[PDB]
Design a protein around this ligand. Structure first.
Ligand SMILES: CCCCC/C=C\C/C=C/CCCCCCCC(=O)OC[C@H](COP(=O)([O-])OCC[N+](C)(C)C)OC(=O)CCCCCCC/C=C/C/C=C/CCCCC
Ligand SMILES: CCCCC/C=C\C/C=C\CCCCCCCC(=O)OC[C@H](COP(=O)([O-])OCC[N+](C)(C)C)OC(=O)CCCCCCC/C=C/C/C=C/CCCCC
Ligand SMILES: O=C(O)COc1ccc(Cl)cc1
Lengths: 322, 322
């Protein structure tokens, strides 16, 4: 009972607006019936190609590459290898190519939404201290993982030449606005924190025009998505329970294992094990739907995790105090 | 004479972000092929149903209704009445749909941009005291004129039996967010400023998540629309010239007449007249595009008014200062 009820109010007040901006979208798409499915797709495309890239750019630019945390980087890199080995072991005694189930597992188990709903919740629970750690995690998720996952997707698609696979992955990666956003953000943060350069006021305000409102529109787009599909749970209970258990139990569990091995101390420990408990990302669903690799589970998990994030997040916040 | 380039920099910095958003939309619609007409319509509808009404609520609820100068309100109403009379006279012998032209003549002549270009421009030209007056003008717009304009739009749509048409217009004006928002906002403004009630943090943040970035998305919609037109001057050179005359030679002139009638004096007179020569806002265009009532004319007016916002304002300042 170390955490007082006052902090529970902090978490709830930080999470409620995100759910309001999502319920509004769901009701507008399904009940109020304002947006036709084509209009919903257009809104989602705008949010995922102009708002998310600029939000990622600003988040990555507001961090210091020269003052990163090597321990945190190593812990995050080791967690996603422990997940790979766990999935490989568990796919040998419980199942065509099985590599699809490892790509899906890494998309479902370890890929928290540390960008749209990561900053608010964690920053409210742990103040401004979390912000920097979350940016550090976001740069990695945007530069290393979201690229290796795409490479794995391409390799799976080719299975049906590695050099041909690499060429195709590179060709499809460049057109992604998020890659350009991340690269420019890093290349600019380096200059900002080395030569002391700062954005001109015009550029900063222009970027903030499209990015400062991207967080709410992200959940609005997600609500439109949930409204679009008829069956909330695309598959039976089986998938839903498996994916929820995988994300919320195995994810933070392997993160705890990696942190203990690396001996992360104090706030880094608590903000690094609790950030792996955040609901699922959407980019993995984008990849799955584009390549049609079990898109019926990657979304059943995304929406369910988005619905259930608050109670589990509070539960792990209480647990970490112990 | 003595105007420093610093003020020019302020005006240009306030104006550029809108152009950045508009050009991004235009490129996304024309050089790229991201958005189809239905998706652009969906984005515009979202902006007209979720962002503009929330911004209206914020503007109304953040201003005291008991500390608004009645003289300014009366002068604004007089200007609108004079413009309506003048346009009715002009359309009586120098004309298709007469009501379809009054809406577009009151959308580019008596609806400046007093929330983005107006406050920086005319708060740097004059002292900070004009901020309160401009805020009064903006709340008056969002409270009265943006409701009367939507009523006229719905009345025009119904026409496309006087009692039946008015009944249809009213029944369509009671299920529009921009009508309930301007009522809830004023009620809450009165409550907060006469009883001390403060909006809860959760609701305020939830409103911010959506309203924020509304201007960027609206200008993106304007760029997307302008991409459809064959040329930037979609309404034609004659129509562009007449729009410029309506917005920069008729608006300010009739506002000067209104101020003389109501005897406004001191900086209030200058702040009231010099704020009517600012480029027309985008909300009229958003509503026109949503209701498809000569959107090209208003879009051209906005595009070619944001370019010459500054020189006309300097001319008017020099005239008034004399
Ligand atoms: C606590 C102290 C009090 C503080 C003040 C209270 C709240 C904070 C203020 C927020 C500003 C919101 C302004 C817009 C509200 C009015 C919209 C609305 O209420 O009516 C939408 C309308 C529903 O009626 P209907 O059209 O289905 O016709 C029904 C016909 N028959 C009855 C026969 C079935 O539908 C439509 O057409 C259009 C649908 C779009 C609606 C979206 C508009 C923008 C957002 C509205 C909700 C706000 C969310 C943020 C805050 C939420 C948490 C408080
Ligand atoms: C050699 C000549 C060819 C190259 C042309 C020249 C430059 C292009 C590269 C960079 C220019 C910077 C603009 C931002 C990057 C986006 C460029 C781009 O083209 O993206 C690729 C893509 C278009 O691919 P596609 O044409 O095949 O259409 C198909 C696309 N699809 C299949 C996805 C639908 O674009 C999209 O879809 C949407 C892109 C939206 C971009 C939104 C902004 C991204 C964030 C930027 C952060 C920067 C902030 C400024 C900081 C300044 C610091 C000093
Ligand atoms: O039209 C006006 O006077 C105010 O101009 C705007 C300001 C913000 C938005 Cl989001 C849209 C329009």
């Amino acid at each position: 009972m170390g955490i007082s009820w006052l902090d529970i109010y902090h978490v709830v007040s930080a999470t409620v607006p995100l759910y309001v901006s999502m319920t509004l979208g769901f009701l507008s798409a399904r009940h109020l019936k304002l947006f036709s499915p084509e209009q919903c797709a257009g809104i989602n495309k705008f949010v995922a190609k102009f708002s998310i890239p600029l939000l990622s750019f600003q988040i990555i630019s507001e961090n210091n590459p020269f003052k990163m945390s090597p321990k945190l980087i190593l812990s995050d890199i080791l967690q996603k290898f422990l997940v790979v080995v766990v999935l490989a072991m568990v796919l040998r005694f419980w199942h065509g190519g099985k590599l699809g189930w490892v790509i899906t597992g890494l998309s479902i188990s370890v890929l928290p939404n540390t960008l749209i709903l990561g900053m608010p919740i964690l920053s409210a629970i742990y103040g401004d201290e979390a912000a920097s750690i979350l940016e550090q995690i976001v740069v990695l998720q945007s530069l290393i993982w979201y690229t290796i996952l795409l490479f794995l997707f391409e390799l799976n698609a080719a299975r049906a030449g590695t050099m041909k696979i690499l060429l195709k992955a590179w060709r499809k990666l460049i057109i992604n606005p998020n890659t350009y956003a991340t690269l420019i953000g890093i290349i600019w943060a380096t200059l900002h924190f080395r030569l002391g350069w700062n954005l001109p006021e015009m550029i900063d305000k222009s970027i903030h025009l499209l990015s400062d409102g991207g967080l709410g529109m992200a959940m609005f787009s997600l609500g439109l998505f949930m409204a679009s599909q008829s069956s909330i749970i695309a598959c039976g209970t089986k998938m839903a329970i498996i994916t929820m258990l995988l994300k919320f139990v195995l994810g933070p569990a392997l993160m705890i294992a990696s942190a203990y091995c690396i001996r992360l101390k104090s706030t880094l420990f608590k903000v690094a094990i609790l950030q792996a408990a955040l609901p699922q990302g959407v980019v993995p669903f984008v990849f799955a739907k584009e390549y049609n690799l079990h898109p019926e589970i990657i979304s059943t998990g995304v929406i369910f995790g988005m619905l259930i994030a608050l109670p589990t997040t509070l539960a792990y916040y209480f647990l970490l105090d112990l």
